[PDB]
Point group: C3
Chain length 129, copies 3
Amino acid sequence: TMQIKIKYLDETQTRISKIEQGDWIDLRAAEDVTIKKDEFKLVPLGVAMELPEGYEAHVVPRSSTYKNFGVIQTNSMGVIDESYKGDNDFWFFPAYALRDTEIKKGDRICQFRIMKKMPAVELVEVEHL
Amino acid sequence: TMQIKIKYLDETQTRISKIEQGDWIDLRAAEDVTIKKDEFKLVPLGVAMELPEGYEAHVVPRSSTYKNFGVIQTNSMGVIDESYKGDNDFWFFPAYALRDTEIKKGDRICQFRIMKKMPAVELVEVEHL
Amino acid sequence: TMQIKIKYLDETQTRISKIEQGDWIDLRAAEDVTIKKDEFKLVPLGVAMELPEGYEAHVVPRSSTYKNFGVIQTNSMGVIDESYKGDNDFWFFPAYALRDTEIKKGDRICQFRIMKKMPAVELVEVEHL
Ligand SMILES: O=c1ccn([C@H]2C[C@H](O)[C@@H](COP(=O)(O)NP(=O)(O)OP(=O)(O)O)O2)c(=O)[nH]1
Ligand SMILES: O=c1ccn([C@H]2C[C@H](O)[C@@H](COP(=O)(O)NP(=O)(O)OP(=O)(O)O)O2)c(=O)[nH]1
Ligand SMILES: O=c1ccn([C@H]2C[C@H](O)[C@@H](COP(=O)(O)NP(=O)(O)OP(=O)(O)O)O2)c(=O)[nH]1
Ligand SMILES: [Ca+2]
Ligand SMILES: [Ca+2]
Ligand SMILES: [Ca+2]
Ligand SMILES: [Ca+2]
């Protein structure tokens, strides 16, 4: 199987290694985050990762995230590149609150999977298609 | 040649037609739903599916879902796993209404495709990246 | 390497051809767009493409789009099929503004990659799963 190296922000972050069979993986808030209605905050997720060469990760909310927390993800789907593999390259979930809300440290807030990056392409300009 | 088994909620749901291979497939509201501006409702899609093994489905709006139906999708992209294949595992579109709206039975509110699940990965903690 | 043919709206659009290595590609507003709070506009991107056969494109916001512009993409992830390849099939970004905003001509507003279309599938209706 493919290795992903993961570094946690600190010792209190919930470790997320288990036997994986192709399911998306839940990520968790690194700290309590309060968000007022119609405000935006980056929810830190407390993990940095070196993804497999030639891969990227996609991040979206969980199914019940809206019900529980009343937030939407402002970028729709977050794309994490194999190059965001630095020692300070921590992941976040960009949240817009549709109601006053609180997200607690340790809460599952979004989920990711990996995906092979697109193949090499060359764009060629033409005057007409 | 890959098969998806599909169960409809009832006889009144408009069946999905012979497909054009590879194109996303539109899904229809299973009943009339009224949603007031700033309200959230699960819009039933009136279908349950057994996806091929090792696949998942992704569900997103149409480009015109906002113009036609007044809603955004609260989970950004719905991910339907192979394991959501039970006889009562019906699909929904989680709608937040940005204006008052009357969605109708049969309205093509979103679209789906299948995709292979990500490979088996092993997360390994490291102190530093 | 696969080719994508690209046609620009006019001579003033910024050409986006360069060496590609699987990264998503930024697309840019074709003209100034003003969007008031709680309004929606299709932001023109000034490009039409013939994608490789058997492939589709996916379009999402850039990571900083919400901070810089206050817009969310109403369809979450836009899907451009291979058949959207006509001389007047210009791409757009469906934007809903959460605050009064201005996007300037040439601003990077979203990004795309390609992905192979789903395989041929046969839907088989069953009475029970
Ligand atoms: O939802 C997200 C999106 C991105 N990220 C990470 C990956 C991304 O590289 C980083 C932000 O760095 P940049 O501001 O450089 N954005 P990006 O890497 O997309 O830059 P570019 O526009 O050059 O591709 O945040 C998240 O943690 N969550
Ligand atoms: O937009 C969606 C998303 C999910 N679904 C389906 C699939 C999902 O399995 C189901 C909701 O079941 P759960 O509350 O068990 N959520 P999920 O399967 O995502 O759970 P987990 O967090 O364990 O992966 O609704 C939709 O119909 N539309
Ligand atoms: O974000 C997007 C989405 C689609 N598009 C273009 C390409 C796509 O083929 C076309 C239609 O997309 P949708 O299928 O999401 N909308 P709809 O079902 O309303 O259009 P059609 O009736 O043409 O399928 O719009 C964009 O330019 N940006
Ligand atoms: Ca999950
Ligand atoms: Ca409002
Ligand atoms: Ca369509
Ligand atoms: Ca990018």
